[PDB]
């Protein structure tokens, strides 16, 4: 849940940031709430847990998730944090993994890269928009050409 | 002349190869994965020609109800739970197996898998029980392949009667998800308590009143999942606390 | 290597470039310690370090070394590989001695004596043994023997007509230095039999003088080897003669 | 197996003008089974039921292992002479040997020959070469008894450390011993050799190895949680205490430098005590199992050993390798651990360890003087139920200061 | 013949995958499973002892 | 220690293991540098770049030691050491310094 | 004295400590030093020269 979320905002929580380049806004506080209710459902159902209460609560405030921690405070002037770390994560480096071959990838998971061009082509032989050779790029500094955005 | 007229008889060279003019990579989790039901949340793709649109409709959607259309800006998020799914439902202890020899008046010996209930898609299972057809692409590739990679390799012989341990096979399989599911299996067996644990344990929680002797047989076959760190569980107990806010029912 | 009856070849003497070599190294006895000997509690666990005893002195494991001496050695067995082809051509055992091969691990504890080596431990450093600087010493000794013929001999031609402007700078065709040199040289001499690797040898040595003419191109260079170094130290500055002198 | 090393040394008569063997005891110990040294064996003496605290006959898991040798040594014997020399009393029932019958039948034609120490060498038995498929069994045994009559104390045991000779195969597969203690793993493991001849350049081979490397290391304080080989290393549950079990755990980050080259070392227990750690125990036997189906490297050094165990065909090396002692007792290797982990900054400089240390020293008075009492407690009869005590046992020099020097040099 | 590695390629090893850039076809796959036991023990009171 | 009088000694004197002690030291003062002293951003946070105080000369933290001195130095305590069972005995403040 | 000089002196070995073994062949540090000040096949003394 933590490394999930921190890829869909700017987050300074510890993790690579393969799928930068893939389009998403950076999200609020409250739409990562959303997201991650999905998260935590996945889990419950993949897991055979129907308990709600698991999980379910995490999101109830600023659930910008980073290092969950809690502490107590004495009168003296004091406290005393416990600040319980997590080791091993096996999904987790799975997940990241899943990731990386992805960036690879990517047109097995119908996700596919580039752009287009807008191009009068009339003829008997020609490939396919799958298939370029060369000229369907541009340049701005080309002439006779103008670009625009 | 297709198929190998052998005397009286026919043998049938089921196409190890899908026999298309177009054939595509197409993500479909547990396609050929006769287990004990399913997860239910498998990933699943149309071909490339169907509206693929589908698989993306389940983050900021909500609002817009256009069947044609995904929003781009929430493509990210969209991916991301895909991929969760695609790891949630590969998630699964590949059961050990029975092996035998090739029966097949082909070339026999070689050990290959007996498929769930019956014999299904063994020409793919096994790309090396397809004889040897004609001269075409298929065969081209058949021609670059070595036989002996077909099956079983090695199985974990030690076993206390038949229990194995390991069954070391080679087949039609995707490197990814068994790489996933043998890092799940690790998880699994880390997690492996043995009883004397146990007894010593509960006894000595008991404060001395009982003892719950467990007797155990010579059996490395076993597994236990329960061992945890103190870590995990104050961490679920953080929780449980965040859980009460308030709200003393 | 390059012909050396080939044109290009400078002969640019230096106060700069002030000849040197490595003629003798520090060899005082206070000089060689650095410093403590490794050992070890007693010989099980980590316990007695209240006790120790002296690694394999039998035929290894000694104190750690000299990173002093480490450093020098290596220098002086440079000035060997400065004649390699030449000691690969004679078929003098040649094969550089790689002094860092000697140097072997060893790991536990480093003092001067039991006392104070109780409370040190340095694990896995390094050591050398008697028996290895012997045969290390004997290698080092036996090459220099054998270049004593050609130590005088390079020395000969390099005062026949001296390359050594101490105060400067000189110049004068090579060639015309060369070609009088051989019309005029001893025939006796090793010199006359190994033109080529004397002349590739002084080159190395002496910055001051280049190569014939490998590439005509590019027979000049301004940097040489290493000894640049020490020479800047030997030249003439704005205000004192030598550095070292004074 | 598929290599001509069928090489079994007998063990030697401690004094008595005899092997060390009780008839009546070897007779009534077949009480389960028939066979030689098998799984039966094993399962009984470390039992999933019980381990018995001095038993009457057997005073130490050991005690089984001492007669056991003594066993095969005596009528086991017989075999290695070109047409089975089998009498005395029992008799093997068959020409593969089988099973073992207390009493010649019908025909009693082979003869013994009065038997000293003798080196069973089945490679000159026909029959056994011939069925190299199923004899495969007494390969196992032959090795291991070796190992136990080379010398005069515990274990002579071989060590091996790879570098980055660890193929993607063989670390994946070492992850499914993750939470498994060497206690279980053991009889398994053993049981592995029996199983048929495998393949010298298998994955089986270089698995046990390297345990066998993570034990040791793990064992004498140098891998650890901080000092990993990738991951890999024992936990020994409760540490430097005389009741400390070694659990496999993946400490996963501070993973241990890449060696030069190669290592390979041997290793022997030259304390008594060793006889009430059944660990070290079990381990050489794991061991001993692959060596079974491999050219065991580097040979022994005629001066490290006894007087009676000179001189001997395979085993005498110059130029060779060397038998390193161990820690012997328990004691040292706490201080070794302790340190180590002291240096470390993992656990409190000056407290949990002499904690430890103090009931070590306890533990061991009294396992130790219990032990060597009865030891004393044999006498005159052609028995000894248990490896001879000696006063210089005690001693704590044994290549002590050597083995941490070796281990020292692991990590790196 | 990328995709299909450990199949067409002798000098590899049956496991071996090329990842993250390739998802192999045919590997050497594990085929597993174990004893998964009711916990069956017997109590006796101790400290009574 | 052994028993001098005893059986077993050998009198091998060889050029390989010539005499030698430690005499004396180099101490030039030109030897004496290795080198920086030690200072402080006037004493406030890492801000005051531009100013530094050394560090305490009044009782302590002075400059980088000497490498070299440091290591000469060790040796020349070494050579004490090489008597200190005959030191202890006399009873002189034997206790080896430890640099 | 004499434990002294055998410490100084590699030279030189201690009376019957073992009668067994009286010599050795690593005696401490100095050996270095004095290698340097043992005549060569070539050279009287390195340090000399």
């Known amino acids: ?149 | ?249 | 290597t390059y012909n050396i009856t080939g044109d290009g070849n400078s002969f640019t003497p230096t106060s700069d470039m002030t000849s040197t070599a490595a003629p003798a190294i520090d060899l005082k006895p206070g000089v060689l310690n650095p410093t403590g000997k490794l050992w070890r509690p007693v010989g099980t666990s980590v316990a007695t370090i209240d006790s120790l005893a002296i690694v394999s002195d039998r035929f290894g494991q000694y104190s750690f070394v000299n990173e002093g001496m480490r450093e020098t050695f290596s220098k002086a067995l440079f000035d060997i590989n400065m004649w390699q082809p030449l000691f690969q051509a004679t078929k003098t055992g040649c094969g550089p001695i790689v002094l860092s091969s000697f140097t072997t691990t060893t790991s536990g504890y480093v003092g001067a004596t039991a006392g104070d080596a109780l409370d040190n431990p340095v694990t896995n450093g390094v050591f050398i043994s008697t028996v290895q600087i012997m045969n290390l010493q004997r290698t080092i000794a036996a090459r220099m023997r054998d270049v004593a013929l050609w130590q005088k001999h390079l020395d000969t031609a390099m005062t026949m007509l001296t390359p050594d402007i101490s105060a400067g700078s000189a110049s004068c065709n090579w060639k015309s230095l060369l070609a009088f040199a051989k019309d005029i040289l001893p025939l006796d001499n090793l010199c006359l039999t190994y033109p080529n690797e004397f002349y590739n040898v002084a080159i190395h040595r002496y910055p001051a003088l280049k190569p014939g003419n490998p590439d005509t191109k590019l027979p000049d260079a301004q940097a040489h080897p290493l000894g640049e170094v020490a020479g800047a130290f030997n030249a003439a500055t704005s205000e004192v003669g030598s550095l070292v002198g004074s | 197996m598929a290599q001509r090393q069928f090489f079994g040394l007998t063990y030697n008569f401690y004094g008595q003008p005899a092997p060390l063997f009780d008839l009546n005891d070897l007779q009534e110990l077949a009480g389960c089974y028939a066979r030689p040294w098998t799984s039966r064996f094993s399962h009984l003496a470390i039992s999933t039921g019980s381990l018995p605290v001095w038993s009457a006959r057997y005073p130490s898991v050991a005690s089984r292992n001492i007669v056991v040798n003594t066993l095969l040594g005596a009528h086991l014997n017989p075999f290695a002479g070109g047409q089975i020399t089998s009498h005395q009393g029992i008799t093997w029932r068959d020409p593969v040997l089988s099973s073992l019958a207390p009493v010649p039948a019908i025909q009693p034609p082979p003869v013994w020959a009065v038997a000293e120490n003798v080196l069973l060498d089945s490679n000159n038995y026909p029959t056994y070469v011939l069925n190299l498929s199923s004899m495969w069994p007494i390969n196992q045994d032959v090795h291991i008894m070796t190992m136990w009559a080379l010398s005069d104390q515990g274990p002579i045991y071989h060590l091996e450390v790879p570098v980055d000779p660890m193929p993607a195969a063989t670390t994946a597969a070492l992850m499914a011993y993750t939470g498994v203690p060497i206690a279980h793993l053991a009889q398994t493991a053993y049981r592995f050799a029996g199983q048929l001849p495998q393949s010298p350049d298998s994955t089986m081979v270089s698995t046990i190895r390297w345990l066998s490397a993570i034990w040791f290391g793990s064992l004498t304080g140098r891998l650890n949680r901080s000092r990993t080989c990738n991951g890999f290393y024992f936990e020994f549950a409760k540490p430097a205490l005389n009741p400390d079990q070694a659990v496999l755990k993946w400490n996963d980050g501070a993973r241990a430098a890449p060696p030069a080259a190669a290592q390979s070392s041997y290793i022997r227990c030259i304390s008594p005590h060793w006889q009430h750690q059944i660990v070290e125990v079990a381990g050489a036997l794991m061991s001993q199992s692959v060596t079974a189906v491999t050219g065991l490297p580097a040979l022994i050094d005629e001066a490290t050993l006894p007087a009676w165990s000179q001189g001997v065909a395979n085993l005498t090396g110059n130029g060779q390798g060397v038998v390193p002692c161990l820690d012997y007792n328990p004691v040292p290797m706490a201080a070794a651990r302790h340190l180590q982990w002291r240096q470390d900054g993992l656990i409190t400089a000056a407290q949990e360890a002499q904690l430890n240390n103090d009931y070590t020293a306890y533990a061991l008075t009294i396992e130790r003087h219990l032990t060597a009492m009865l030891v004393a407690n044999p006498i005159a009869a052609g028995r000894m139920p248990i490896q001879p005590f000696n006063a210089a046992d005690f001693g704590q020099a044994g290549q002590t200061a050597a083995a941490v020097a070796l281990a020292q040099a692991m990590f790196v | ?49």
């Open chain 5, 1 to 49: 013949p990328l995709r299909w590695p450990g199949l067409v390629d002798p000098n590899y090893r049956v496991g071996t995958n090329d990842l993250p850039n390739r998802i192999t076809l045919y590997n050497s796959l594990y085929r597993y499973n174990f004893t998964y036991p009711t916990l069956d023990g017997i109590m006796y009171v101790r400290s009574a002892t």
């Open chain 2, 1 to 249: 002349l297709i198929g190998f007229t052998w005397f009286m008889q026919m043998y049938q060279m089921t196409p190890p190869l899908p026999e298309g003019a177009v054939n595509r990579i197409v993500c479909m989790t547990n396609w050929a994965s006769l287990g004990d039901e399913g997860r239910g949340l498998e990933v699943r793709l149309p071909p490339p020609t169907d509206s693929s649109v589908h698989a993306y409709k389940t983050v900021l959607s909500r609002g817009y109800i256009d069947n044609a259309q995904f929003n781009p800006l929430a493509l990210r998020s969209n991916v991301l739970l895909m991929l969760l799914q695609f790891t949630l439902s590969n998630l699964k202890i590949n059961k050990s197996s029975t092996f035998t020899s090739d029966v097949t008046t082909i070339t026999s010996g070689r050990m290959i898998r007996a498929f769930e209930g019956r014999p299904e898609l063994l020409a793919l299972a096994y790309p090396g029980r397809a004889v040897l057809p004609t001269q075409t692409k298929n065969a081209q590739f058949l021609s670059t392949a070595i036989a002996d990679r077909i099956g079983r390799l090695d199985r974990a012989n030690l076993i206390g009667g038949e229990v194995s341990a390991m069954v070391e096979c080679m087949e039609l399989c995707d490197a990814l998800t068994l790489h996933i599911r043998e890092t799940y299996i690790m998880l699994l067996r880390s997690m492996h308590q043995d009883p004397t644990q146990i007894v010593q344990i509960v006894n000595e929680c008991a404060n001395n009143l009982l003892n719950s002797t467990i007797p155990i047989s010579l059996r490395p076959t076993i597994l236990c999942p329960w061992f945890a760190s103190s870590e995990d569980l104050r961490l679920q107990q953080v929780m449980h606390l965040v859980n009460i806010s308030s709200n003393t029912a």
């Open chain 1, 1 to 149: 849940a933590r490394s999930a979320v921190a890829q869909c905002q700017d987050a300074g929580f510890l993790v690579p940031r393969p799928l930068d380049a893939l389009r998403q806004f950076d999200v609020t506080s409250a739409a990562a709430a959303e997201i991650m209710h999905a998260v935590n459902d996945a889990f419950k159902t993949a897991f055979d847990l129907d308990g709600a209460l698991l999980d379910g609560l995490a999101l109830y405030g600023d659930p910008r998730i980073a290092d969950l921690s809690a502490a107590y405070l004495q009168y003296g002037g004091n406290v005393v944090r416990e600040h319980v770390p997590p080791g091993p994560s096996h999904i987790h480096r799975a997940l990241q993994q899943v990731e990386s071959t992805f960036m690879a990838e990517m047109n097995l998971f119908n996700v596919a890269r580039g752009n287009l061009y807008l191009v009068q082509t009339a003829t008997n032989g020609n490939w396919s928009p799958m298939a370029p050779v060369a000229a369907p790029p541009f340049v701005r500094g080309g002439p006779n050409v103008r670009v625009v955005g």
